[PDB]
Amino acid sequence: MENFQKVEKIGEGTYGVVYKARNKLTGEVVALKKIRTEGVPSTAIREISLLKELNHPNIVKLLDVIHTENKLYLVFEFLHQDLKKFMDASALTGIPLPLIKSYLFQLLQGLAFCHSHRVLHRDLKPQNLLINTEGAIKLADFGLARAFGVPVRTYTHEVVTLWYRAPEILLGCKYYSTAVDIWSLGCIFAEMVTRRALFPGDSEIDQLFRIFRTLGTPDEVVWPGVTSMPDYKPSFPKWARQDFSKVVPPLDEDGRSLLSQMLHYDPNKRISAKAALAHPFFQDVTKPVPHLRL
Numbered sequence: 001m002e003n004f005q006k007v008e009k010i011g012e013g014t015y016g017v018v019y020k021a022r023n024k025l026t027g028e029v030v031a032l033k034k035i036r037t038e039g040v041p042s043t044a045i046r047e048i049s050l051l052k053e054l055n056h057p058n059i060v061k062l063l064d065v066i067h068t069e070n071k072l073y074l075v076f077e078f079l080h081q082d083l084k085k086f087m088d089a090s091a092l093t094g095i096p097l098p099l100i101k102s103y104l105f106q107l108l109q110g111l112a113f114c115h116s117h118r119v120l121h122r123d124l125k126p127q128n129l130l131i132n133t134e135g136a137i138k139l140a141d142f143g144l145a146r147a148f149g150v151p152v153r154t155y156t157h158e159v160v161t162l163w164y165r166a167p168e169i170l171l172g173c174k175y176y177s178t179a180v181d182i183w184s185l186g187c188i189f190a191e192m193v194t195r196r197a198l199f200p201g202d203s204e205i206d207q208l209f210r211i212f213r214t215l216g217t218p219d220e221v222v223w224p225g226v227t228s229m230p231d232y233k234p235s236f237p238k239w240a241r242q243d244f245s246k247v248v249p250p251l252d253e254d255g256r257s258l259l260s261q262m263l264h265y266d267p268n269k270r271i272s273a274k275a276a277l278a279h280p281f282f283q284d285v286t287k288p289v290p291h292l293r294l
């Protein structure tokens with residue numbers, strides 16, 4: 001880009017480098033993502049361009065999409081910190097429950113919105129949840145997975161995390177439903193509460209087996225059709241399901257109930273974002289402000 005003074009390199013995304021930049025004309029500060037190449041499928045460009053109309057307060061705004069000289073630039077609204085960095089910074093004391101609740105509530109609203117427009121994220125993780133000083137949290141990179149797919153390694157060869165991946169994806173499902181995002185958010189909810197990743201898998205089978213060890217090896221009883229999935233193996237070990245009281249202490253029964261519904265094995269049974277917003281857990285939701293040192 002020629003009309004963008006690039007303040008700094010913010011990070012490295014799944015698809016490309018991210019810079020903090022200042023638009024010389026509007027003076028606005030944005031997050032500029034630079035992506036890759038055999039001409040780049042125009043099918044992706046159309047899909048991505050449609051995201052410019054997917055506007056919501058809990059969705060990072062996509063300001064522009066520019067395809068030029070073998071590169072694809074995505075211009076996004078800028079937020080000062082991501083949830084991964086905030087959780088690390090809050091590791092010693094933990095994120096207060098009221099803020100955890102507020103963040104989950106807002107993330108579900110963002111999901112409810114995109115899902116109602118038939119757009120899935122598919123690769124939700126702390127790294128793409130951005131926060132500001134106002135107490136808001138927004139989902140970034142929504143819709144990019146439908147356009148580019150989720151690779152095994154990023155453009156820098158970094159391993160794309162499997163920690164938040166729904167079991168139906170790990171088992172080979174061809175079609176992803178909105179339920180995949182609810183699963184990822186549930187894993188993130190648990191991580192905020194316990195200050196440790198729920199299922200820190202370091203391979204696809206380790207990821208699947210960690211899920212099984214906590215939630216029990218799935219069977220036709222809890223997940224009709226699971227034994228017919230592409231990568232299901234009758235030889236998977238059979239682990240017993242653990243009590244959520246042991247999984248996310250010391251979260252209260254309302255939060256444990258909601259998390260259990262977000263982590264149902266059967267995608268068709270997993271709670272929707274819309275239904276989750278009405279869960280008793282959010283009865284006393286508020287909008288606290290985090291302490292951010294920028």
Ligand SMILES: CCC[C@@H]1CCc2[nH]nc(C(=O)NN)c2C1
Binds near residue numbers: 018
């Ligand atoms: C998930 C990585 C891509 C995001 C796109 C939107 C976005 N907005 N701000 C940032 C940022 O990193 N600020 N420190 C990002 C990064």
